[PDB]
Design an enzyme around this catalytic site. Structure first.
Site, PDB file in Angstrom:
ATOM      1  N   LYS A   9       0.142  43.236  21.228  1.00  0.00           N
ATOM      2  CA  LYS A   9       0.557  43.543  19.857  1.00  0.00           C
ATOM      3  C   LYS A   9       1.585  44.677  19.885  1.00  0.00           C
ATOM      4  CE  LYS A   9      -3.949  42.293  17.958  1.00  0.00           C
ATOM      5  NZ  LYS A   9      -5.210  42.789  17.340  1.00  0.00           N
ATOM      6  N   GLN A  57      -9.149  47.123  15.486  1.00  0.00           N
ATOM      7  CA  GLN A  57      -9.357  46.099  16.497  1.00  0.00           C
ATOM      8  C   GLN A  57     -10.846  45.757  16.617  1.00  0.00           C
ATOM      9  OE1 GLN A  57      -6.717  44.741  18.048  1.00  0.00           O
ATOM     10  NE2 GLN A  57      -7.986  43.236  19.141  1.00  0.00           N
ATOM     11  N   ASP A  91      -4.193  42.787   8.320  1.00  0.00           N
ATOM     12  CA  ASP A  91      -5.124  41.916   8.987  1.00  0.00           C
ATOM     13  C   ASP A  91      -5.931  41.052   8.002  1.00  0.00           C
ATOM     14  OD1 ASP A  91      -5.334  42.221  12.040  1.00  0.00           O
ATOM     15  OD2 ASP A  91      -7.322  41.632  11.367  1.00  0.00           O
TER      16      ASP A  91
HETATM   17  N1  LIG Z   1      -7.872  43.478  13.549  1.00  0.00           N
HETATM   18  C1  LIG Z   1      -7.798  42.365  14.293  1.00  0.00           C
HETATM   19  N2  LIG Z   1      -6.630  41.566  14.279  1.00  0.00           N
HETATM   20  C2  LIG Z   1      -6.528  40.509  15.148  1.00  0.00           C
HETATM   21  O1  LIG Z   1      -5.429  39.667  15.076  1.00  0.00           O
HETATM   22  C3  LIG Z   1      -7.556  40.206  16.015  1.00  0.00           C
HETATM   23  C4  LIG Z   1      -8.654  40.942  15.977  1.00  0.00           C
HETATM   24  N3  LIG Z   1      -8.790  42.024  15.105  1.00  0.00           N
HETATM   25  N4  LIG Z   1      -9.648  40.683  16.860  1.00  0.00           N
HETATM   26  C5  LIG Z   1      -9.453  40.051  18.050  1.00  0.00           C
HETATM   27  C6  LIG Z   1      -8.477  38.863  18.001  1.00  0.00           C
HETATM   28  C7  LIG Z   1      -7.792  38.661  19.387  1.00  0.00           C
HETATM   29  N5  LIG Z   1      -6.422  38.390  18.963  1.00  0.00           N
HETATM   30  C8  LIG Z   1      -5.507  38.040  20.062  1.00  0.00           C
HETATM   31  C9  LIG Z   1      -4.197  38.598  20.115  1.00  0.00           C
HETATM   32  C10 LIG Z   1      -3.268  38.115  21.035  1.00  0.00           C
HETATM   33  C11 LIG Z   1      -3.644  37.118  21.930  1.00  0.00           C
HETATM   34  C12 LIG Z   1      -2.656  36.541  22.928  1.00  0.00           C
HETATM   35  O2  LIG Z   1      -1.484  36.927  22.952  1.00  0.00           O
HETATM   36  N6  LIG Z   1      -3.094  35.444  23.552  1.00  0.00           N
HETATM   37  C13 LIG Z   1      -2.279  34.639  24.459  1.00  0.00           C
HETATM   38  C14 LIG Z   1      -2.857  34.662  25.866  1.00  0.00           C
HETATM   39  C15 LIG Z   1      -3.057  36.017  26.465  1.00  0.00           C
HETATM   40  C16 LIG Z   1      -3.541  35.918  27.889  1.00  0.00           C
HETATM   41  O3  LIG Z   1      -2.690  35.867  28.801  1.00  0.00           O
HETATM   42  O4  LIG Z   1      -4.770  35.876  28.104  1.00  0.00           O
HETATM   43  C17 LIG Z   1      -2.257  33.181  24.026  1.00  0.00           C
HETATM   44  O5  LIG Z   1      -1.298  32.488  24.411  1.00  0.00           O
HETATM   45  O6  LIG Z   1      -3.239  32.726  23.401  1.00  0.00           O
HETATM   46  C18 LIG Z   1      -4.925  36.588  21.881  1.00  0.00           C
HETATM   47  C19 LIG Z   1      -5.859  37.062  20.973  1.00  0.00           C
HETATM   48  C20 LIG Z   1      -6.204  39.080  17.840  1.00  0.00           C
HETATM   49  O7  LIG Z   1      -5.147  39.617  17.591  1.00  0.00           O
HETATM   50  N7  LIG Z   1      -7.318  39.295  17.148  1.00  0.00           N
END
Ligand SMILES: Nc1nc(O)c2c(n1)NC[C@@H]1CN(c3ccc(C(=O)N[C@@H](CCC(=O)O)C(=O)O)cc3)C(=O)N21
Ligand SMILES: NC(=O)c1ccc[n+]([C@@H]2O[C@H](COP(=O)([O-])OP(=O)(O)OC[C@H]3O[C@@H](n4cnc5c(N)ncnc54)[C@H](OP(=O)(O)O)[C@@H]3O)[C@@H](O)[C@H]2O)c1
Ligand SMILES: NC(=O)c1ccc[n+]([C@@H]2O[C@H](COP(=O)([O-])OP(=O)(O)OC[C@H]3O[C@@H](n4cnc5c(N)ncnc54)[C@H](OP(=O)(O)O)[C@@H]3O)[C@@H](O)[C@H]2O)c1
Lengths: 295, 285
Positions: B55, B99, B124
Site C-alpha cells: 500500500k 490495518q 476503507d
Molecule cells: N483497513 C484495511 N484495508 C484493507 O484493504 C485490508 C485490510 N484492512 N485488511 C487486510 C486486507 C489485505 N489486503 C491486501 C492488500 C494487498 C494485497 C496484494 O497486493 N496482493 C497481491 C499478492 C501479494 C503477494 O505477493 O502475496 C495479489 O496479487 O493478490 C493483498 C491483500 C488489504 O488491503 N486488506
C-alpha cells in the site's frame, strides 16, 4: 392441506401483554425507573396524528411513558435539529422517533434530520449507523425497523428453524426490504434479494422456503410462484374499492393470498398479518432500549 | 477453450497511472498541497507488514504521502483510540485506515476502534455510517470497502452488464462478503449470499451468472459448480498461494475468471488509492 394462518392480531396482543408484564416487573425491580418514549412531530397531518395516537396508546397500556412533541408547520430545519439534540441529551428518554413525513412550510432535509438521532435511541432503526450495524450482523444490540422486525417474529412463530433455509425477499427498501434481508441473513438463511430489475421473478420466488414480499404491487406474486410448503410473509397494504365491505374498500397484500394459501405451510393474511405486529415491535424496541440503558 | 483471465495486475496498473496523473494535476493546481494517507497498525504480523508495504509503495508511486504508525502488541483499546482521534483532528491527513486484524495481547473491540474513525477519512469504508449508506443504496455519500470495489471493477472489465444477472456471493464478512452483496444489489443484480450455514452450496453457486467467492477455504468452490459462462471473482488468498476457487477446473467452465495471485489483490490496493485521492479532492472542494 392449506397453509396455517399467522394471526398477527392475536400474536401482537400476546406480545403487548407480555411487554406490559415486563415493564411492570422492571419498575418493581428497580424503583423509580420509567421506560420513556418520545415521538417528535412536525406539522399536523391527519394520518400522522392517527398513527401517533395509536402508538402513544399502546405505550401507556404497556406502562411506557410516551411523550408527544408536536411542532408547527412554520418550524424550520434548525429547530427540528435542536429538539433532536435535546432528546439525544435527555437521559430520561430511552428511545425516540421522528414521525415522517415532516409537514412544514419550509424545506427540511429529512435524511439529515433522521441521521441526527443518537443510534442508541433510534427505536425505528432507520439511521445510517443503525442500518450499518444491522446490515453487518450486530443483531444483539441494534434497533430493527418495526415492519421487518414483526416479519421475523411471525416467521419464528411457525416453529420452523430459519438456519440453512433459502429465504427470498422481494423488495429492497430502507423501511422493509433491506433490513428484512439483514435479519434473515444473520439468522443464517441463504438470502436472495429481488427487486424491479429481477428477471424471471417467478422462478426466483419459487426457490424460497421463506418468502417475504414488500413491493407495493397488489397481488403480483401469484400462488403458482410459491414453493410448496414455504412460509409466506406479506407486508403489502394495497387498497381496492369493494362496496361489499363496511367502509367500501378492501385491503389486499402483495401476494395472491387465495392461491398462495393452498401452497404455503404458513401464510400471513391481509389485513391481519404483518400490519398488527408493527406497533408492538416499536414497543418492543423501546423496552430493549430501556433495559440497555438500565444495565 | 478456457475462460478469459481478468488480469488484476495490468488493470490495476492502469488505474494507478490514471491516479498518478490526477495527483500531479492537482498539485499543479494547488502547489504545495499533498494528498495524505495514514495506516495505523497494532502489532507486528508478517503478512500485515507485507500488505502495508505494498500500500505504501503504490501510494508513493501515485504521489500520495503515506504514513505508517506501528503500535506495540502491549497496546490497549484506549491507546488506539488516542491515535485515531489524533488522525481525525490532523487536518493534513485526508484518509486513514486501521490495518486488520489487530495484533495485541489485550482485548480490543474492533468495531469500536473502526467506528471512531471520521467517516470523511474512512477510505476503507468500514465504519457503520459508510456501511449503513452502502447497505441502503446511498452511494453518493460513501466510501465502499476496497476489496468489493476492486471486484466490481473487475466485473465491469468483462463488459457484461450486471443488471438482471443472478449473482452469488459466497461469504458474508464485513470486509468483503457483506459489502460485495450491497454493491451487486445496488448495481441491480439479483443477489444470493451464502455462508457456512448454507445447505447445498453447489446448487447455489450453480445459479451465479456472476460469482464472488470470499471464504478463505482453499479451492473449496469446485469448478463443477460454476455456471457455464459465468464471471468468477476470487478474493481468496490461501497458503503455494491459491484462491477459494479450484482455478484449473473453474477456468474450463467460466467465461471470465480472476487468477490468484495477480487478481483481486492488486485491485484492492488500487481502489484504496482511489478512495484516498477522492478524500483529498473532497477536502479541497
Ligand atoms: N483497513 C484495511 N484495508 C484493507 O484493504 C485490508 C485490510 N484492512 N485488511 C487486510 C486486507 C489485505 N489486503 C491486501 C492488500 C494487498 C494485497 C496484494 O497486493 N496482493 C497481491 C499478492 C501479494 C503477494 O505477493 O502475496 C495479489 O496479487 O493478490 C493483498 C491483500 C488489504 O488491503 N486488506
Ligand atoms: N403493515 C404496515 O404498516 C407497513 C409498514 C411499512 C410498509 N408496509 C408495506 O410494504 C410495502 C412496501 O413498502 P416500501 O416502503 O418498502 O416500498 P417502496 O419504497 O415503494 O419499495 C418497493 C420495493 O419493491 C421493488 N418492486 C417494485 N415493483 C416490484 C415488482 N413488480 N417486482 C419485484 N420487485 C418490485 C422496488 O425495487 P426498486 O428498488 O428497484 O425500485 C422497491 O425496492 C407496501 O405495500 C407497504 O404498504 C407495510
Ligand atoms: N485480494 C485482496 O487484497 C483482499 C483484501 C481483503 C480480503 N480479501 C480476501 O477475502 C477472503 C476472505 O476474507 P474475509 O475477511 O471475508 O474472511 P473471513 O472473515 O474468514 O470470513 C469467511 C466467510 O466465509 C464463510 N464460510 C467459511 N467456510 C465456508 C464454507 N465452507 N462454505 C461456505 N461459506 C463458508 C463464513 O461464514 P460465517 O459467517 O457463517 O462464519 C464467513 O462469512 C480472503 O481470501 C481474504 O484474503 C482479499
Amino acid at each position: 392441506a392449506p397453509a396455517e394462518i399467522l394471526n398477527g392480531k392475536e400474536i401482537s396482543a400476546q406480545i403487548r401483554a407480555r411487554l406490559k408484564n415486563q415493564v411492570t416487573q422492571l419498575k418493581e425491580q428497580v424503583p423509580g425507573f420509567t421506560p420513556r418514549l418520545a415521538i417528535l412531530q412536525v406539522g399536523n397531518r391527519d394520518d400522522s396524528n392517527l398513527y401517533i395516537n395509536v402508538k402513544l396508546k399502546a405505550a401507556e397500556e404497556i406502562g411506557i411513558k410516551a411523550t408527544h412533541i408536536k411542532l408547527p408547520r412554520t418550524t424550520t430545519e434548525s429547530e427540528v435539529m435542536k429538539y433532536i439534540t435535546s432528546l439525544n441529551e435527555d437521559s430520561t428518554v430511552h428511545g425516540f422517533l421522528v414521525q415522517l413525513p415532516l409537514d412544514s412550510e419550509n424545506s427540511i432535509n429529512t435524511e439529515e434530520v433522521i441521521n441526527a438521532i443518537a443510534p442508541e435511541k433510534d427505536v425505528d432503526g432507520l439511521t445510517s449507523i443503525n442500518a450499518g450495524r444491522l446490515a453487518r450482523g450486530d443483531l444483539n444490540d441494534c434497533f430493527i425497523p418495526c415492519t421487518p422486525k414483526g416479519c421475523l417474529e411471525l416467521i419464528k412463530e411457525t416453529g420452523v428453524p430459519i438456519a440453512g433455509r433459502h429465504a427470498v425477499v422481494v423488495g429492497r427498501s430502507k423501511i422493509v426490504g433491506a433490513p428484512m434481508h439483514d435479519l434473515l441473513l444473520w439468522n443464517n438463511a441463504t438470502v436472495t434479494t429481488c427487486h424491479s430489475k429481477t428477471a424471471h421473478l417467478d422462478e426466483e420466488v419459487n426457490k424460497g422456503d421463506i418468502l417475504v414480499v414488500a413491493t407495493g404491487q397488489p397481488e403480483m406474486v401469484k400462488g403458482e410462484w410459491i414453493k410448496p410448503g414455504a412460509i409466506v410473509i406479506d407486508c403489502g397494504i394495497n387498497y381496492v374499492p369493494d362496496d361489499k365491505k363496511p367502509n367500501g374498500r378492501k385491503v389486499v397484500g402483495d401476494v395472491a393470498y387465495d392461491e398462495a394459501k393452498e401452497r404455503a405451510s404458513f401464510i400471513t393474511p391481509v389485513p391481519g398479518g404483518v400490519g398488527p405486529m408493527t406497533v408492538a415491535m416499536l414497543m418492543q424496541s423501546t423496552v430493549e432500549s430501556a433495559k440497555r440503558f438500565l444495565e
